Amino acid sequence: LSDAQYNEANKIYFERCAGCHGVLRKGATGKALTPDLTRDLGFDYLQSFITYGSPAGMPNWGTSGELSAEQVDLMANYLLLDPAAPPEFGMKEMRESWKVHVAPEDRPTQQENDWDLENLFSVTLRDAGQIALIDGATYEIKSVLDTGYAVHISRLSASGRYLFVIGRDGKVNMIDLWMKEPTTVAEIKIGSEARSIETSKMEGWEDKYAIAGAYWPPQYVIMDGETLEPKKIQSTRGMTYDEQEYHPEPRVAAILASHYRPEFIVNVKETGKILLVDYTDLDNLKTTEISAERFLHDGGLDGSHRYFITAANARNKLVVIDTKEGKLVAIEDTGGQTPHPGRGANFVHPTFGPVWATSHMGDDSVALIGTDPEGHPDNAWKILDSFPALGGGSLFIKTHPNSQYLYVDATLNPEAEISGSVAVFDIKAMTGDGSDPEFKTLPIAEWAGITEGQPRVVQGEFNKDGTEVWFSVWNGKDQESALVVVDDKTLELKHVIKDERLVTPTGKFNVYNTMTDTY
Amino acid sequence: ALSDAQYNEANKIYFERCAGCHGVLRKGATGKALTPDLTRDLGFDYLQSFITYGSPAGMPNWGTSGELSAEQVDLMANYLLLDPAAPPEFGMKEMRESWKVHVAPEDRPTQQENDWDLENLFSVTLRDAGQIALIDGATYEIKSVLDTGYAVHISRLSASGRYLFVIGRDGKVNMIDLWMKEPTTVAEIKIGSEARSIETSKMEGWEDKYAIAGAYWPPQYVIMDGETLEPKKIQSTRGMTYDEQEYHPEPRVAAILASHYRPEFIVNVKETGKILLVDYTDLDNLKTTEISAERFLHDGGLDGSHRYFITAANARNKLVVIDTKEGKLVAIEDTGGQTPHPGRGANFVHPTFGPVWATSHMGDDSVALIGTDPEGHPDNAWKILDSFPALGGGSLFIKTHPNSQYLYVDATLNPEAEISGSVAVFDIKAMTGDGSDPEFKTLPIAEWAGITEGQPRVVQGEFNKDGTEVWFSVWNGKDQESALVVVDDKTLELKHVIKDERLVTPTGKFNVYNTMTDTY
Ligand code: DHE
Ligand code: DHE
Ligand code: HEC
């Protein structure tokens, strides 16, 4: 390629490919596109693949017209070359990507549709680059909205009016749920690779801000809660906590919002730092940089919403932060392999008191940590129990204050008999004597009534009353997927949601439970 | 063609012993640029001679001093003909490897074991000698000359006045116990490749707990134990510019001060234009305030009440004011001059305007005053109240003291030897804030010292403990004659001239008491 051709190629790569293939072409959701593999595949294989895509999730750039004839080829040739240096993504680049479709002045002053917004589910349509807004009681798809390729998660503002979605490429969409036809009212791009977004949830700061975290570049950005305007960009480049050596690319993992202080809770993976970022004053920016444990990923607030509990997954540890005092309080080994809680599950154990649970990706165990230092001090921040569920490959555990059951998936398990089902333990029957709590196996995939592809079940999500729990039956892009609704009280099939438009449904977020952090 | 081992060897030496003055990318600092476009023209032999014998302009004689062997000198001469290596990081492992406690704290004196008058001692920078001279403030005797290391820049004192900390341009930190029978370095460490600043914890209750050093490269600061220098917490300063919000890969740490309101360090981050308030109460659950200020931050000082930090964003001609009590920016004002360079500045009570802080300028002859009293003089607070001329451009330091009525302004870099050898003195008590330029008396400091040969540059006034006498450095070349001139504050007359064979290129002078209490 000439110098200018490589520049277009390089520009297109970082904006439209790095979200799935990575900034250093090492692959993420998409495959490694490094030269090693790339020379042997050769031009032709690469031109064809960029043109036609595949049902595994690679877009048909050529045939969709998304990249015209000649860009497939620039992107065929570029891929043979050596990996470019990943560029920065600052204020100037964010402001150019930032678009306000509907100014705040021109938005409704009251809900202008008859939807039950708090019982609404925002579902990620992975390979379709869209979200589906589904009614929680009548189970109908209210709307399907385009966000962008590699959509990952949905988060709600504290009043429940604004829906924020972010995809793997750092694309952020803001939707106004009060419009007659809810749509994207603002959008912006915050990096080349990202996974996290969150809203200000401190009483009094409702709808004030949104924050987004990037894998690359190493940074988070605080945006205006009503326009998505980028106010403050913070770099997360810094030193590891245990050896204090500089790390040039610390990714931002999960981001939560304090309910005790007007702060955002930011996980910085490779440095092992948890940041408490005060948004009361963005020019005189106060932060608490907490030394924790490397490999931070996901986590959630305890039942009282004071303590942040998060997985340092490759080290098999749970890190606990007190958001009121602003300091690390404990680091404990779960005794399992690679904890992956999502936001985890808080409940009252019959004998141990308030606990938070996590399942694991590397084994079948479920661990319980005591979360009440005031009333159960001898149990606080200790692993009180550990027992098996369906099997390894678990991603999400769920419960709700109105139910006595603990749901645990097994999404990544090799056996389909397992990955298509869910374990359910009766919380009220828990004793803590050594006896493995028994669990009931729900045949989620069987209830979908599907045979084709390779359906996997993932993540339970409750409705607003806590009477029904939803699970995604995740199947390939060209196959039939579904959402199974389980009746919490009877642990019986309630409803099966199937629709042409329900493509690769994964993360599901109930508006009320997400806005209030109820889990 | 140099081997890998040889090359690694040359690189370690370069970053450890040369970058301090030649720059981490070899583009120069006080030393010349050593990038291959210049060196290949000079050639091996020229480079080998220079490294071997050094020069009286400040380049050490590496070979002839035995610091580098003949093999190493040739190793460094070939390395300089090669393309610049990638500047390395300098984390905990590298800091700890350089960390050395010569006298554990349990083995040091429990009380002053010398007869000196510690509080009135002056720690003087002997720039091209790699040393500091400890001089008696009353007898004017050189009590001692201590090796710190090449590129020595400045001295700072722990809050109690017992420990003397010196930092050089290579990031070499020395800690000296002034209580020993015979004071010396009791601990040392290196905190980077290039550095300029250090400061001690000055919050009441934190006396002697911590010391902080800021580096130019890598971009970071380290908080160290105040008694042993153990590196406790390293923080990168890499980040975003405050105004354009673009990543900046090399934000240098300029001046570092200490708050008297909270247990915090006040760190200037130059290229990003950020002032950091760093809480040292708990280094693991580290609290900081990142203040968006103005780019090109450099030096500054606290006002007379020690509540507010006043600092120059020198290339943008601004003074940035930070309230250390509330931890917030309070003001940003243009001084009306070119390149404000206050050092720690000068605080005094102006006759009509109230409490003010002043600074002189490198780019012109103006002296500016900013009101520093929001409570008693609301309308004048954080506003430029007056601007008037002193000797001429090239000014670096302005000074005064609570026990004096005069404002002394040097002019070190002026091209005219008459001006650069002199100091301007203003009568604070005669000022009026009516627009008319105050008059000044010219003190012929170089002339008073009897120094005429070479280029005697007079720099930085520094008062003694009682604020009765002000010292000025008569800076001359290493091979020329230098001196310290002691001026009698009450009469503005020569009190004493300090001369000694060991007094080589004397620059910055720090009175123990005035430095430990931030009296200026
Ligand atoms: C940082 C991060 C968060 C926390 C977001 C927040 O705090 O707002 C998160 C949350 C999530 C959540 C939030 C659960 C909740 O209830 O909070 C879900 C459902 C989810 C479904 C998946 N994630 Fe996620 N996820 C990543 C990162 C993250 N995922 C990856 O780096 C990873 C492991 C690989 C990748 O390349 O993307 C990855 C793969 C997956 C999946 O394969 C999942 C199962 C399906 C999918 O859509 O791709 N991730
Ligand atoms: C960041 C910094 C500080 C604040 C220290 C602190 O807060 O603890 C400082 C302070 C200082 C102070 C502090 C005085 C005070 O009263 O606070 C002095 C006297 C001083 C004498 C000089 N400095 Fe300094 N100085 C630099 C940097 C700095 N000098 C430079 O980047 C520069 C411009 C060139 C260089 O490469 O080092 C430089 C040249 C000089 C000089 O040429 C001076 C005049 C004489 C010399 O020894 O080289 N610098
Ligand atoms: C996420 C939605 C993707 C984006 C955006 C892009 N690609 Fe992709 N790509 C993705 C996946 C999940 C896969 C695997 C396909 C499979 O069927 O297994 C791919 C694959 C490719 C390949 C083929 C490599 C191979 O080893 O077979 C190529 C050459 C490729 N992708 C290129 C490419 C380019 C140039 C993109 C930017 C326009 C791009 N992809 C975007 C997922 C995603």
Ligand code: HEC
């Ligand atoms: C500050 C204390 C220095 C240190 C440490 C080192 N050098 Fe230096 N160097 C310094 C100065 C002020 C000068 C200029 C001398 C002059 O007479 O003007 C130099 C010069 C050199 C040169 C000569 C370059 C030229 O253009 O003439 C060389 C080759 C050189 N220095 C090399 C060098 C090396 C290899 C060092 C590490 C051992 C080193 N210098 C340290 C100041 C300082």
Ligand SMILES: [C-]#N
């Ligand atoms: C997803 N982790």
Ligand SMILES: [C-]#N
């Ligand atoms: C130096 N200033």
